[PDB]
Symmetry: C3
Amino acid sequence: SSVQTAATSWGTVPSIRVYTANNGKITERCWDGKGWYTGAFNEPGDNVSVTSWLVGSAIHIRVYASTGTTTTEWCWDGNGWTKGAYTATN
Amino acid sequence: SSVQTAATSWGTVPSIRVYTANNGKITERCWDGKGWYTGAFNEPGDNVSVTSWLVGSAIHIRVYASTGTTTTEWCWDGNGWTKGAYTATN
Amino acid sequence: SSVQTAATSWGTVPSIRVYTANNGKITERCWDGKGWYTGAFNEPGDNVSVTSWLVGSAIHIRVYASTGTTTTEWCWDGNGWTKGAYTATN
Ligand SMILES: OC[C@@]1(O)OC[C@@H](O)[C@@H](O)[C@@H]1O
Ligand SMILES: OC[C@@]1(O)OC[C@@H](O)[C@@H](O)[C@@H]1O
Ligand SMILES: OC[C@@]1(O)OC[C@@H](O)[C@@H](O)[C@@H]1O
């Protein structure tokens, strides 16, 4: 068994976020051009995917964390992570 | 065992598509700014990845669905899903 | 058990890169508008994710290859793949 990752990036420098699912926990490593550091995202999950988009200079991130058949969406919109409206009927 | 997801997004609103592989079947949930709904994509696969690109206002999506060592590419180019030219020698 | 893929794309044609983890090995298939071909990326790993960004017309790619709890970052910046600075404490 190996960890499972998901990655997103924005800008030209760039900024990168790498999410790793490891033993049921998803953590985040961050690059903003001057070294990797540990991000504020730490949530349960066995599987992770991510997407992001810019609006001007403002980044928006969506992380999809799944355990069993339940997927939880986590949202970054400039001022902290929040749970999103995503639902699915798996 | 957990489901496995892949996500893409475009624009600023934005639009988001989340693909979930669950028990050998890949389905699609969609956001266009006003609620999540079930998309037209429903194909067999144990693993999924996705990428997309805009040409002006027109979205193009590629979904890579894998079962065993066989990966099938599915294409959205504005008027329905079609099988793509992707091949690999896995 | 199925192979596991990750995909990225850039431009409008577009260019696409699809990475496949298969039996501990990650390989790359490439589209630049006129057929799929095998890319120069061939590295060990049981899991793969990818992100990319344009700077003008220059593509930059980051591939995250994981075996066990160890993730290795591979970088394309226009002139060959190189190992990146990414670390994590998994
Ligand atoms: O500046 C770092 C940070 O705020 O960037 C946005 C998100 O990736 C956060 O989890 C992360 O801590
Ligand atoms: O408007 C929704 C839709 O047409 O958007 C493009 C694709 O994601 C389709 O599967 C989906 O049904
Ligand atoms: O032109 C093809 C190529 O150079 O494109 C950039 C990377 O995807 C490489 O592995 C690949 O061989």
